[PDB]
From Swiss-Prot, chain A:
This is CRISPR system Cmr subunit Cmr5. The keyword Nucleotide-binding does not apply. Keywords: Antiviral defense, Cytoplasm. It comes from the Archaea. GO terms for cellular component: cytoplasm. CRISPR (clustered regularly interspaced short palindromic repeat), is an adaptive immune system that provides protection against mobile genetic elements (viruses, transposable elements and conjugative plasmids). CRISPR clusters contain sequences complementary to antecedent mobile elements and target invading nucleic acids. CRISPR clusters are transcribed and processed into CRISPR RNA (crRNA). Part of the Cmr ribonucleoprotein complex. It comes from Archaeoglobus fulgidus (strain ATCC 49558 / DSM 4304 / JCM 9628 / NBRC 100126 / VC-16). GO terms for biological process: defense response to virus. It is found in: Cytoplasm. The keyword Cytoplasm applies. Belongs to the CRISPR system Cmr5 family. SUPFAM superfamilies: AF1862-like (SSF158568). It holds the Pfam family Cas_Cmr5.
Amino acid sequence: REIEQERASFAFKVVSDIKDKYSQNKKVQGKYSSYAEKAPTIILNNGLGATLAFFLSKLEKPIDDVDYKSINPESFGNAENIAYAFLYKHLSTWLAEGNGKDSAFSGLTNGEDPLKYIMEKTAIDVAISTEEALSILNWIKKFAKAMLE
Amino acid sequence: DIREIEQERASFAFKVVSDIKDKYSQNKKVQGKYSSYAEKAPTIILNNGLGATLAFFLSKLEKPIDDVDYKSINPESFGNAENIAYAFLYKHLSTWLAEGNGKDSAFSGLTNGEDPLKYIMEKTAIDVAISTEEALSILNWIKKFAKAML
Amino acid sequence: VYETSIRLHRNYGVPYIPGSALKGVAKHYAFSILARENGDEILRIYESVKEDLKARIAKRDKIKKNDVPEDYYLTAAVIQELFEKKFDELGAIRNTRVEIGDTVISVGDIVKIFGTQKEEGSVIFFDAFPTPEQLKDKPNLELDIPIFFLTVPAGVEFTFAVASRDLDDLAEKAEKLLKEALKKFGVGAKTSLGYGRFDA
Amino acid sequence: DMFEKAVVFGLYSITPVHAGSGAELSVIDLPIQRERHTGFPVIWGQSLKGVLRSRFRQLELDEKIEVESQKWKWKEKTKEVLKEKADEFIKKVEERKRDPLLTEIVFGPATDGASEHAGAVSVGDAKILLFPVRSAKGVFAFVTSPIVIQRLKEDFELVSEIENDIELKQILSRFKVELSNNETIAGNALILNGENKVILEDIVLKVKSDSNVIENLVEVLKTLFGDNFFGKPIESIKERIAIVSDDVFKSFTRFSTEIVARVRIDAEKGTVARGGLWYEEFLPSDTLMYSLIAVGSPKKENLPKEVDNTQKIVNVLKVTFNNAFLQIGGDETVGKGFVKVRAGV
Amino acid sequence: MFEKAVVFGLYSITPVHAGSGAELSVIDLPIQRERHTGFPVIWGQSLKGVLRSRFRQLELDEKIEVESQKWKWKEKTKEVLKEKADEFIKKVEERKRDPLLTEIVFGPATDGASEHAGAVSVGDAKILLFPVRSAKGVFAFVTSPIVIQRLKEDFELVSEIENDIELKQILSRFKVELSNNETIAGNALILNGENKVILEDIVLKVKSDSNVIENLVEVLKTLFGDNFFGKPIESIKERIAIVSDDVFKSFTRFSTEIVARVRIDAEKGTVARGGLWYEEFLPSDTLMYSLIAVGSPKKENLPKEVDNTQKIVNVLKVTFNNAFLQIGGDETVGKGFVKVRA
RNA sequence: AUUGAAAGUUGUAGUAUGCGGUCCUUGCG
DNA sequence: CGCAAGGACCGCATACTACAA
C-alpha cells in the first residue's frame, strides 16, 4: 500500500500545484479538470504511445526534439496549452522518476523520457508503463475533480 | 526481445520527420507542404487505392508510372517545394513498405525488397489490401509526428 | 485523384444533396436574417460576448482589439457563438420575431427546431434526390470550365423533405425557412457565382 | 433458460447508418462498432434494446399501442393492476421517474426501480448478413461470406432449441460451401459478359460453377421476411446474390464504407472554423442486418390478464414493430440512421 | 471419492461477461480473472448455479430423460418419501425446496442444508483457445504451451478417477516449446511471404513442427465429439496457432472487447447524470473447458432409477449435450449464450 | 508418569437487476 | 490556395449473510 500512498501524495501535490497557478482564473482550473478526466479514455482506446504523441501534438510550438523535462507550462500561451503542458509534465515526471530516489516508486523509466523509452524498449516495458499511467491517472482524476475549481 | 510494429512505426516516423526538420529548417514552406500532404494522403488512399496514390505521387514528380525505383529517388533533386515534399513523402512510404523499420528490427517491410508499385502491379488482392493497411497505419503515425513537431 | 469531385451516390451514381448541407444552410440563413434586422439589439444585449469575439478576431488577425469593426459579419459571428456553448443567455433575447417569408418565428422557436448542445432538435432534414423522370430524358450531369468539373445542369428537379420528431409543429416554419434559404442563398460550393440557387 | 418463443428481426437500411464507437486518433475520426477478432461491422444488442424501449414507451404514452385490438391506456390499465398504489405509480410516471406499465412489464423496470424484478425480452446482437457492394456489370450486389452462413446456422439451431422445432435445423442443414480464395458462387445477373468472371470493386476473379446453394439462401429469406426483401421482389435478390471467401469479404468491409468530410464553417470568415474538419464513417445503404429476440414469461407481480403468456407478448411485439421505420445510431436529425424492420418466426 | 468424471466444453456463441467483484480501477466492470497468472477464468460457483437452475427448470417440465422414462417430480417424490412426501410437495409449490432429482444431484436448497451434500462438483472453467485477429486469413485461434500443460495435468487427475492410461499417453505424446517469438501456425494463417505470421500487432516466425498441432486436433476429436461444436474439425485444424507464454498472456489482457455504454434521458435527448460507463467482454468463439466430478450419492433413500455414479453420469451426459446455456450478466442484451458439449 | 485421549469451520447459495456512444455542427471560401 | 474536432458525461441505486452445528 506504500505505492498507493505514494500515488495519492503525488496526485495531491500536482493538483495543488495546478491550484497555485491561476488560482482565481477558473479558466485554467476548469480546463485542467476536464483534461485529467478525459485522459484515461484515450489510453484505453489507442495505447500509451498514441496518447503521448497526441499530448505532444496539441502543444502549440515547434517542440524540437522530445523532452519530458523543459517545456514550462507557464510559457504556453493559451490556457488549454498550459493545462495540457501541465498534464504532460506530471504524467512524464511520474513515469520517469516517480517521487524521487528515496520514494517507494522510483519510476519505471529510470529517469528516461517516456516517449523515447517506449520507442526503444521491449513490449513488457510498454505494458507496465501503460498500467502504471492508468493507475496514476485514476487517482489524479478524483483528486483534481475534488478540489480544483 | 519482442517489439510490436507499433514501436517500430513510431521509431520510423520519428526518424523521417526529424530528418526533415534538420535538413530543411529554413524552408518553412517545404515543412508546411509536407505536413499538408501527410494530412491529405490517407483520404486519397481510402478513396481510390494505394496504387492510385502512388501513381499520383509519381505524376506530380514528372516520372513514368510503369517503372519505378524508390531507392533511386534523391529527394534533393526536385526544385519546387511541392515537388520536394512529394518526393520525400513518396520515398518514406515506399521505403517503409519495402524494408519497414529494418532487417534487424521485428518488422522488415512487406514486399521483401521490391518496389511497392510493382508489388501492387503483380500480386493478388489480399497482398495489396494488407499493404494498404500498413500504409494507412504508418501515414497516421507520420501525420501525428509531423503535426506535433513540424 | 482528380482535382475535383462531386458527392455521387455510392450505389447508383446519381448526384444528391445531403441533409447536413440543408441544416447548415438553413441555420446560416436564419442567422443572417436575424442579424440583418435586429442587429443592434443583439450586439447590445450580449456585450461581453461581443468583446470576447472582438478580442479573438484581433488575436487571430494579429490586429488591435479596437480595430475590429462592428459590421454585420461580427454580428453573425456573435450570434453563432451565442447558439454555441454560451446558449444559456440566449433566453434573454428570446422575444424577437424574425419575419421569415410571411411568418414570424421567435428565436426560442429557432432553438427548439434546430436543436442545441443540451437538447436534441425536433426537425429532421432528410436528403434530396433528383426525380428519375427528369433523368429519363434530360441529362443529369454536365462539364464546366483547361480546368473542368462536373456540375448538375439547370432545371434539374430535386425533392426535399422535413419531419417533426416531437409533437412540436415547427415543421411548417422549418419548411418555409428552408424554402427561403434555397431561394435566396442556395446550397453548394462557389455559391457566390450564382451556383446553388433554387426557384419555385 | 426462461425463454420459450423467439423472433428473428431483419433490418434493412435505407439511409447510411452510423453506430458510434467513441472517437479514435486514426484517419477516421468517428469509426463504427466492430467485433475485435473478426473485424466485421456489428450493432450491439444494447443499442437495439434502447431504441426499441424508447419507441415502445413513446407509443404507449400516446395510447397508440394496440394490444388485442385495443389501446393500452397507461393510467387506466395500471389502475386495475397496481390497485391502491396506482395513484403513486401514475404520478411517478408523469414525473418521468418510472416507465409506463406496459414498458415496465415487457422491457423490465426503469432506472429508479431496477431492483423490482426482471424483464422478458433478450434482444441480441445484430450480425451482418448481406453487404451491398458496387459491381461492374449489374449494380449493387449482396455479398456474403461462409462465416456468416455458419453463424446463421448456429442461430437457427438456437431458435430450434428454444421452439423445440427441428424444422429450422433441417432447413439450414444443407448449407455447406467451400469457396476458394479467388472463386465466387455468383448470380447470373452479376456475371460479366465474358469468361464467366465478375469484377467486384478492384477484384476480378473466376466464377465457380455450383447450384442448389444460392436458391437455398433465398428460401431462408422467404421463411421469415414474407416474400419481399424489404418490399422489393425476392427474384431480383435471388438473381443478384454473390458469395465470396472470408478474406475478400473482410477486405470489402474495410474499404467499402461511406467516408464523409463534414466541416463547420464559421460565420466571421465564412470558410471553416478552427479545427472544424473531420471524417465520418458510415455503413452503406441497403445493408441487410439480422438479430434475434427471445421472449420469456413475464416476471412482474400481479400482471394484467392481457399480458400473461409469452405468446401474447410475442404477438404484441410482432404487431407493433412489423414493417415499421426506426432510427438507429447517431445523426438522427442530420438524416442518417433510418432502417426498415421486419419480424418473423 | 469422485469415482466418475465428465469433461465439459463450452463455446461462446455471443460475447460473455461474467461479473467480477467490486467495480474498481479504470475499467468499470471487468471479467473474472486470477491474480495468480492473469488469464480469464469462470469460477465454478456461477457454473454450478446456472446448471442447477437449468436442471430444476427442466425437471419441473418433466422433460428430463431419466433412463428414457421422463421421471415425474410429484410421482417419484410420492414413491420415495411416502407419507411425508405430500408435505414436501407443498414446499415445492411455495418454491422453497426443489424437486427430488435436482435435490439429489446438486444438493438441497438453502433452508434444507443439513441433510446431504451435493453429489456433483463443478470445477473452474479454464481457457483453451482464444480468438485473435490476424493479417492473412482471419480470426486465428491461439493457445500456448502452458495451456497444454494444464490440460495434461487435468488428464492425469482424470486418470486418478477412471484409470485412463491411454488418455495420459496421448496427452504425454505432445511436448512443444516455442522460445520467444516463434509460433506453430496452420497453413492458412501463414503469410504468402517467407513465414512471417502476423498476429494483431506482432510479427512472428513460423516453426516447422506442425505435427504437434495435428496431435492437438486429435485430442479435441477425442474429447469433444467429432464436429468441433458444430463445424468441421479439420476446417478448424487449418487455423490454430501456438505461441510463447508471455505473448499469450499479453493477448489475454489487451484483446478482450471493450464497450462504452450510456443512458439517454427521457426527453432531453442526451446522456444523464451517471450515464456513461465501461464494460469488458470476453470475445465470441472462445473455447473454455472445465472438469465435472461425481462421487457417491449421499442422499437418504435415493430412487432406484438413479442410485449409482454411472446412472448420474449418464443422466448428466444426456441432459447436457449440444444444449445451450445463458451465462453471466447482461442476459437481456444478448450476452452469455454458449454451446455445451460433454 | 503432563486437565490428558478423542472431533475436517463443514454443509447449501449464478455480481445479479435497469440503462440507445448520444447532442451540437453546410466540406468551404 | 489553402483549411486539419471540441466540448459536454466520466457508474449510478440496491442487494450489503442466513440457518444449523
